[model samples]
Target: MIGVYITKWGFEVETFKKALPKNTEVKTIAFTGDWIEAVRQFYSTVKEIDGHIHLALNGPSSLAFGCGVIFGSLKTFSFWHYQNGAYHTIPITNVRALKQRLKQYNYVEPFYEAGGKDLVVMLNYSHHEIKTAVKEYVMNKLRLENPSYLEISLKGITGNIPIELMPTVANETSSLLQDVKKHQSFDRFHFFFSCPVPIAFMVGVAFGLYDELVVYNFSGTYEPVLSFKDLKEVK
Candidate 1:
């Protein structure tokens, strides 16, 4: 079993509490106003865990809190939503939307160059107001194209937005849908999100992006950003 170390910042405590299993041992890393030192001690404690340790950081604290612990060592790390007070309510739909928006902005490369800062900005911009704007833009574009193969509908109670997929499948028994498209198939496709894959792929991509950003950001100037004094006050 993996050990989890959570940095306390009010909202984060609740977020991790909900996602973690009941028997899981959780130690709160106190901030005490000095967030930098708190993060430092948090990382050290994580290193001491004989078993695996998972770190969870909110959107705002992603860079600051994550940087403190993951700066050095070969330990495994994972990210979970915290800023929104709950893991499930953290606008993951927005994250999926943001991934699509990156294509339109033609700033994916620049975003890659900027590293963690770009992700932080994308997360911040994915508020309710921005989601509406993105929805409008996508809808307007679809109306003009009037594509026959595309399908749009607001079905199901999941409340997820509809996204178009090519090489449509009519029914489960349809043999035509089984064969992949030739020219527009996965082999020739160079785009990011051409078709629907598994959720595991999404996780791998996100974590890969995080790893890339971490390496790029800490190429030379690497140091522990948290301290023990900051976590002393936290029980």
Candidate 2:
């Protein structure tokens, strides 16, 4: 069993790292301004992940929500909240049980690429609107000239201009995953969505360590910025 300490605002990374046993690997994905970077780091790290896992959530609620959304009930992983100064497993699927277990989390099996190249995933809940023109501009900036694009835009069923899901299960993450599975043939994917904190976090829990997934958010420039590298690659 491994422990994952997902930090957000003021959580001490060093303390988490130091608190664990010497054998315990402490990987902290800090939720700074660049939420995308933190998501990328978390996803990449937990790829090919399996077995009972622990999540010491200390920063943004999204950190916890993201885990549940990303993994849902499909990914075999669970949560671990630090109550009474000790970490205990959260056995029930409260909000984002996330994936209960993370096994073979990273390996994209030997599948044929029949669906061209790139998949554009958009989960816009008015988190930060990057206009269509600007989105194309960033796509261009990313330099994906050869990849054919298939865009996936998610919205709420209710009648609203902003398009928001008030309830927890309103987003339909299960169906989203179903769609994602349908398009595995695509060689890679590009994420282009300004979503609510909950939406982003849920999407991220499902993000895992898929190298082919490249996410871009508008912060003056459109580019894929990576944070801490995967431990598997570290020597």
Candidate 3:
């Protein structure tokens, strides 16, 4: 296996290198600005690798999405997330075989209508349930107008999402989000992710260039790490 450390914020490259498998062949895709160029660089680097990739990144959602486009489902990858002062590995390999173990279930829950234009999307793939915390954050911090709520979670086990089912989970969640975004016509999407970093990146790829995207990062509490309102021009 190989480790791919990608960054747009100029993270200390070697510092995060410890996050990957020890003594693995490591490649770096570091860049500043030039989103398209960064994606190209990622493709050029990844295509040369002959083994599985374990990817780590510190960058915007767009970069993640862009990288996702390059890799897609064709290549097996493991996404790394930094939590509790350490990095955790989430692997996506032979998803078809892994998905066979999952029960025939829909991760997308029924939509909750609040008669508002704004929407709250919760992507729950981990063992913890953040539905309440996400709702509270939206009401208390964002204070949107009766924003609708939607949650996507694994079936059978409410928690303890198997690492194997994650790629499918992420893909399904993104598909559901896209479906809602296209048909529901919400003004803004308030996202709260409770999953591995790779799933987040894969979802970002699925998001494409959608508007009004607000993604939160969690430490002790949630903060808006990626806000599209500031970047998008008013229509």
Q: Write the per-residue lDDT of candidate 3 for residues 1-235, one digit (tens) a residue.
A: 7777888655477766776668887778876766556666777787767568888887655456556645545567778766566666777666433223333436544355555778877777665578888778778987777778887766665655455565676666666775665556888777776665566677765564455766566667777754564323211
Q: Candidate 2, overall lDDT?
A: 0.47
lDDT of each: 0.29, 0.47, 0.65
Which 10-residue window of candidate 3 scores lowest in summed lDDT? 96-105
Off by over 4 Å in 3: 1-3, 6-54, 57-111, 229-235
- Winning candidate number (TM-score): 3
- Residue 173 CA error for candidate 2 (Å)? 3.9
Candidate 2, residues 78-184: lDDT per residue as tens digits?
A: 34444456554434334333333323222111112233456555544443344464447645665555544433333333333221232232235423433455555
Off by over 4 Å in 1: 1-15, 62-73, 83-85, 88-107, 111-235
Indicate the worst ten consecutive residues by lDDT in candidate 1. Answer: 165-174
TM-scores of the models, in the given order?
Answer: 0.35, 0.48, 0.60
> What is the per-residue lDDT of model 1 for residues 153-227, given as tens digits with 9 covering 90 to 100?
212213322222111111110111112121132211001111121121222222222221211111132222222
Candidate 2: residue 86 lDDT (0-100): 55
RMSD of each: 15.3, 9.7, 6.6
- By TM-score, the candidates rank as 3, 2, 1
